[PDB]
Write an enzyme that holds these catalytic residues in place. Structure first.
Site, PDB file in Angstrom:
ATOM      1  NE  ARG A  80     -26.042  -5.588 -53.184  1.00 19.49           N
ATOM      2  CZ  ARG A  80     -26.750  -6.091 -52.260  1.00 19.49           C
ATOM      3  NH1 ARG A  80     -27.084  -5.336 -51.103  1.00 19.49           N
ATOM      4  NH2 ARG A  80     -26.906  -7.313 -52.187  1.00 19.49           N
ATOM      5  CD  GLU A 110     -28.236  -8.929 -35.266  1.00 18.92           C
ATOM      6  OE1 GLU A 110     -28.375  -8.658 -36.357  1.00 18.92           O
ATOM      7  OE2 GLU A 110     -28.326 -10.164 -34.537  1.00 18.92           O
TER       8      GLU A 110
END
Ligand SMILES: [Mg+2]
Lengths: 181, 182
Positions: free
Chosen positions: B65, B102
């Site tokens: 990105r 995570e």
């Protein structure tokens, strides 16, 4: 593109001898990305080539492809559509499988990003086997998009990618030709 | 700086997906902004205008990105673009930094010769969440002698504490579209 400009671009790309293995020359585009003139020139030349082609969408595969497809999309004033490996795009997608040395992989595209009637330009950093582009072309056409053009910064003319894409009706435009596998 | 109308247009160009990737979280999809030529161009033009007088000498963007937003900003500023990538992608000598995810940790790498003492770097990314990858990127840049005090984002999920985390490193974050929620 003039002979001088093409020569400038060719010299802006670093070639790494014996990488990833002996006998192979890795064509490193990061040295082009670092150079203001080279990077801008590469994008400007691609935009100039397609400015009158009626392109309505530019498609680029992750990741190095993004570095060239996105700026070309901006230069043409059209939307950019990413094609990525499974698990990244959040909305509805369709997928295509392509071959690799010891296996396969997949590429996905958002179903709503390409609409019937769109004329698409695929942009990538380097044309080698052409496998990922072949898969991308199939994704675009499954959504009703029209694609007959693919643009690249580097073309490894020894690997047969250009001919492979021609079998799909794709005309490739490349800025820097390099030999070797 | 950006006008309220421009900021509103950018905010409306981003699709929000309810309960994705899992129930409870409202996802902010930047790909719809990429698809809109007006929104995409506006976001790049605004970032370039924000930093045009900041003495930036290099723009760094993480895979992938950061490629989409950092590279066009580099082109707009007329300075080199330096990619920070996943392990094993960059071909020349690199240094690495580990960051949290995570379910574990991962690394980001940068070419050692891409940043030199005297360079003033702008980091650009699509969305600021926890800020882990940017924190690691700042460490990479400074290990090479580069100076970095700026990070720019298209989206800022202000409820995730990313901005404050980066402030602990002396980074001022500029974001075009703020959104609440996890
Ligand atoms: Mg413009």
């Amino acid at each position: 593109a003039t002979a001088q400009q093409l020569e400038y671009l060719k010299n802006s790309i670093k070639s790494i001898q014996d990488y990833p293995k002996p006998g192979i020359l890795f064509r490193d585009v990061t040295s082009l990305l670092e150079d203001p003139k080279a990077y801008a020139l590469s994008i400007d030349l691609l935009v100039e080539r397609y400015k009158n082609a009626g392109i309505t969408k530019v498609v680029g595969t992750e990741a190095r492809g993004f570095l060239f497809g996105a700026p070309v999309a901006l230069g043409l004033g059209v939307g950019f559509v990413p094609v990525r490996k499974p698990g990244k795009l959040p909305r509805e997608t369709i997928s295509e499988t392509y071959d690799l040395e010891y296996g396969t992989d997949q590429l996905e595209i958002h179903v709503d990003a390409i609409k019937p009637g769109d004329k698409v330009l695929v942009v990538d950093d380097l044309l080698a086997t052409g496998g990922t582009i072949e898969a991308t072309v199939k994704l675009i056409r499954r959504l009703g998009g029209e694609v007959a053009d693919a643009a690249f910064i580097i073309n490894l003319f020894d690997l047969g990618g250009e001919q492979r894409l021609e079998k799909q009706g794709i005309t490739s435009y490349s800025l820097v030709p390099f030999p070797g596998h």
